[PDB]
Design a protein around this ligand. Structure first.
Ligand SMILES: *[C@@H]1O[C@H](CO)[C@@H](O[C@@H]2O[C@H](CO)[C@@H](O[C@@H]3O[C@H](CO[C@H]4O[C@H](CO)[C@@H](O)[C@H](O)[C@@H]4O)[C@@H](O)[C@H](O[C@H]4O[C@H](CO)[C@@H](O)[C@H](O)[C@@H]4O)[C@@H]3O)[C@H](O)[C@H]2NC(C)=O)[C@H](O)[C@H]1NC(C)=O
Ligand SMILES: *[C@@H]1O[C@H](CO)[C@@H](O[C@@H]2O[C@H](CO)[C@@H](O)[C@H](O)[C@H]2NC(C)=O)[C@H](O)[C@H]1NC(C)=O
Ligand SMILES: *[C@@H]1O[C@H](CO)[C@@H](O)[C@H](O)[C@H]1NC(C)=O
Lengths: 49, 50
């Protein structure tokens, strides 16, 4: 969760992506907008003789 | 015969000819992510990228 520059409208709670996954949320207690990024991942290759 | 337009130009850092430079400029090849290995793709920067 990071700080985001998105300007949410007051009737909006969640922000969606192109794949209809939640990308930006609004915290209920404090009204800052949070941006959600999936954790670091990638492929692994093994080079062996 | 003049081959200065298809022989490689040593002034270019990529060592490509003039016509090869035009052929590479005409095709708008995407970075495709092997160039974009940087971790600021994870952070929210610029606009939404495909
Ligand atoms: C085989 O063919 C090549 C290509 O035609 C000949 O080589 C010379 O190539 C240049 C362009 O590559 C011809 O044009 C001259 O370019 C000079 C350099 O400026 C250009 O190049 C730089 C990069 O080097 C660019 O960054 C820049 O933006 C320019 O695009 C210019 O200074 C020249 O201008 C002079 O001549 C014109 C003629 O109209 C005058 O009006 C100007 O006032 C100025 O005096 C020129 O434009 C150049 O003509 C080619 N040379 C010849 C003799 O034709 C080879 O010579 C050729 N070889 C054989 C054996 O045929
Ligand atoms: C990927 O790794 C390279 C190499 O460590 C990083 O390049 C360095 O970046 C910092 C800050 O941007 C510079 O102060 C260094 O001088 C750079 N080092 C070299 C050798 O160029 C690069 O920043 C990393 N990518 C990300 C997104 O952090
Ligand atoms: C409950 O949250 C609100 C913000 O929506 C805050 O102003 C209030 O102080 C909180 N209640 C307590 C008891 O801290």
């Amino acid at each position: 969760l990071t700080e985001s520059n998105k300007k949410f409208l007051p009737f909006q709670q969640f922000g969606r992506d192109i794949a209809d996954t939640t990308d930006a949320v609004r915290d209920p207690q404090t009204l800052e907008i949070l941006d959600i990024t999936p954790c670091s991942f990638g492929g692994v290759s093994v080079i062996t003789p | 015969f003049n081959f200065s337009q298809i022989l490689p130009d040593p002034s270019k850092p990529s060592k490509r000819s003039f016509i090869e430079d035009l052929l590479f400029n005409k095709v708008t090849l995407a970075d495709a992510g092997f160039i974009k290995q940087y971790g600021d793709c994870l952070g929210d920067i610029a606009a939404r990228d495909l």
